[PDB]
């Protein structure tokens, strides 16, 4: 997912931005630190995916 | 690129297994390879009180050097060195001595 | 008996601390020698 994020509008990367943080990131920090979450790789891939959305969002907004 | 690689059948050139064929299990970035049924060490490990306890003397394979193996030709039935040629933009390996692409 | 080192953090810092080495020419040369010698702690700050 790098062209897929590249082909939306600024509003839609703000939506999937807030959903990467909201649904994914926070619930996996809370789920990870409360004994659950066997699958730990999700933390990494979510974090890098927020990096992609902020990158494309900085590239799309202005310069 | 790398001459001996992952799913490949080799023969062993030096030591304890000289002339034994076998398939490469994996290949370690130390420049070593683990080849099945070849460099068998008799480890004996402790039954850790965590998840399952085998105990005993487990006979594993050890990593031999990449330079101690060469891939088995099977058209001549001997060891053979590997080169790299280009075919249709693909860098392919080929056997030396009959020049056959692998 | 009353030994010489009677510690105070405020006098340690006002005297030999970083904002007090940087405050003058010669303390900046002190910091330059401590960085050049390559030193884990330059001043005594904490």
């Amino acid at each position: 997912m790098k062209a897929k994020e590249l082909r939306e509008k600024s509003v839609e990367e703000l939506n999937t931005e807030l959903l990467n943080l909201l649904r994914e990131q926070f619930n996996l920090r809370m789920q990870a630190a409360s004994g659950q979450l066997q699958q730990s790789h999700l933390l990494k891939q979510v974090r890098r995916d927020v990096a992609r959305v902020k990158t494309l969002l900085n590239e799309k907004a202005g310069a | 690129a790398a001459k001996i690689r992952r799913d490949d059948e080799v023969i062993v050139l030096t030591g304890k297994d000289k002339g034994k064929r076998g398939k490469v299990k994996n290949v370690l970035s130390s420049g070593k390879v683990i080849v099945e049924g070849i460099n068998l060490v008799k480890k004996h490990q402790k039954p850790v009180p965590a998840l399952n306890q085998p105990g005993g003397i487990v006979e594993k394979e050890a990593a031999i050097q990449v330079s101690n193996v060469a891939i088995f030709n099977a058209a001549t039935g001997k060891a053979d060195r590997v080169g790299f040629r280009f075919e249709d933009g693909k860098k392919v390996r080929f056997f030396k001595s009959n020049s056959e692409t692998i | 008996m009353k030994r010489t080192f009677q510690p105070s953090v405020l006098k340690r810092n006002r005297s030999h601390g970083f904002r007090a080495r940087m405050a003058t020419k010669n303390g900046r040369q002190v910091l330059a020698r401590r960085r050049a010698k390559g030193r884990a702690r330059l001043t005594v700050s904490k």
Partner: protein, 93 residues
């Protein structure tokens, strides 16, 4: 108001202990590890909006990191912040 991007990064873990446990089962307070730069307004707003409960008041201490060692190599852990979040009479989590 506090933006939601800030407000997600503040809460970090629920704190499990016996002081925490007796705080929940005896005085409505949930104890949780927060961001080190998180203020009490941020923690209150983030529990209001991320566990959808009603917070009465927050009390924040900062816990100092312990100097451990491996072998003969020391190291301080890391300071964190712990928030005693006193909820109202209607709560579950």
């Amino acid at each position: 108001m506090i933006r939601e991007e800030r407000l997600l990064k503040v809460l970090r873990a629920p704190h499990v202990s016996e002081k925490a446990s007796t705080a929940m089962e005896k005085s409505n307070t949930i104890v949780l590890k927060v961001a080190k730069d998180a203020t009490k307004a941020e923690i209150k707003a983030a529990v209001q909006k991320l566990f959808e409960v009603e917070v009465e008041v927050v009390n924040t201490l900062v816990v100092k990191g312990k100097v451990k060692r491996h072998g003969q190599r020391i190291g301080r852990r890391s300071d964190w912040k712990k928030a005693y979040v006193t909820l109202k009479e209607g709560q579950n989590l």
